[PDB]
Amino acid sequence: QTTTVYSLEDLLPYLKQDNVDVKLAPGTYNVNGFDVGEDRLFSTTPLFLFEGSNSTYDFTDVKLNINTVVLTKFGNNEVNEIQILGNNNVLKNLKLEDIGTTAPSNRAQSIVIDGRDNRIEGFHLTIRGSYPYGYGAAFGKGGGSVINHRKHSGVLIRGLRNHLKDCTIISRSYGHIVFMQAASYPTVEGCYIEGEMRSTDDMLAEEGTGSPADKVDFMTVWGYKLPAGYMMSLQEGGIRAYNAGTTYIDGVEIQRATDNPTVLNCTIKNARTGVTLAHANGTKYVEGCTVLGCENGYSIGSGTVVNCGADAIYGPVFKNTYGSDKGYNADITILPPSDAYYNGHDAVAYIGGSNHNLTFRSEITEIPSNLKIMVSGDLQGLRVLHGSNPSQNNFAGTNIVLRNLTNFPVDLHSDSSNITVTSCDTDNITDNGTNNSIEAI
């Protein structure tokens, strides 16, 4: 009852059919510029468009090499390698790798999941080829860019009840690694997501080379010259949810926010953020995750972060997105450093909004001198200096339970009130707020 096919060419017809069970035989399959054309295997993008429903696709031991030149072969159009439009499909075990570093002519996404109740599991994805590569988003990720971009992102989860499970996503590309737009009940489970980092000092060292950053005098979209002393990801987010987007289910076009995301047992390394879901609606749940060397650990806005860990080497493990944040319940272990500290944000956590219940745990005994838990105040975060992104900084914190089971000191700013702090030691806690209560445990 399984059909086995032995070429990309014989695979492509099944993608238009419902209720099929298909296996692409073990092997290595290359897609090159010569394969894209009128006459040719791939006449249109997306390359692999899964239009059927109730189908299973087994790619065990399949290595699919897609030459990045393919991202230029469709004019000025977005190129998608794989898109699922149908429902109730299961794709498993494919190893997909972009070959070379050619940028898209416009933009690209490796995998887009529309429809409902689809699952991608056991994939291994390597994303390459984008422009500019080497500055992350410092010179723009959307309109009004200082340096025009031609982005290439990994997995875009949309649709309803779509699931990415046990996947390895390695990004060497300027774009999101795993992101959700218009997704309702998306689940990301057992995933390993990895980007790579570069110091702003190394970028600034391009002064006088004629580099694209050197040509705009390192002026960022945040309104100031790129500051020294930060470690950035070259990618946009590890797992990031958006409040906008369009998806398609059953031939209906749907424009909505992401809602009800669940992230379980993921490891995110060297990304801008491990898990950011503050812009999703409904119930946000994060459990069993490990965030290593990201610019930011967990920002879910409201909801539940439980049994999660992050290290602090490049940025805070925890950040309330806005003063509007309420009901963020979190239990976060500050993990031993995965590498030397290079955290220019001067904070292990930034807390405000109201009615949160936050527990931080750590075995760390050597505390860098610039790192503290902040309740309110002026965060020295790369993106929020000098009034940039003003709603994401300098905001009040009220009625918050803060269990500091760590040796990190705590700084309660004058805008904080009714913070109930319990701590290993209470002599590293600076209280400049109102009606805050400090108690040793």
Residue numbers in the entry: 1 to 441
The authors write:
FdlA from Flavobacterium sp. SA-0082 is an endo-type fucoidan-degrading enzyme that cleaves the sulfated fuco-glucuronomannan (SFGM) through a lytic mechanism. We show that the FdlA-NTD adopts a right-handed parallel β-helix fold, and possesses a substrate binding site composed of a long groove and a unique alkaline pocket. Our structural, biochemical, and enzymological analyses strongly suggest that FdlA-NTD utilizes catalytic residues different from other β-helix polysaccharide lyases, potentially representing a novel polysaccharide lyase family. Here, we report crystal structures and enzymological characterization of wild type (WT) and eight single mutants of the catalytic N-terminal domain (NTD) of FdlA, revealing its unique substrate binding pocket and identifying the key catalytic residues.
We first measured the enzymatic activity of 12 mutants and found that eight of them (D137A, K141A, H176A, F179A, E236A, R240A, Y242A, and Y242F) almost completely abolished their activities, H279A mutant retained approximately 65% of the activity compared with WT, while mutations of Asn243, Arg272, and Tyr322 to Ala only negligibly affect their activities. In the WT structure, both Asp137 and Glu236 form hydrogen bonds with Arg272, while Arg272 participates in the shaping of the alkaline pocket. In both D137A and E236A mutant structures, the side chain of Arg272 switches to the opposite direction compared with that in WT due to the loss of the acidic residue (Arg272 in E236A mutant also exhibits an alternative conformation similar to that in WT), and partially occupies the deep substrate pocket. These results suggest that the steric hindrance of Arg272 in the two mutants may interfere with the substrate fully entering the pocket and hence the correct positioning of the glycosidic O atom, thus resulting in the complete loss of activities of D137A and E236A mutants. We found that the inactive FdlA-NTD mutants exhibited similar Kd values as the wild-type form. These binding assay data clearly demonstrated that while our inactive mutants lost their catalytic activity, they maintained their substrate binding ability.
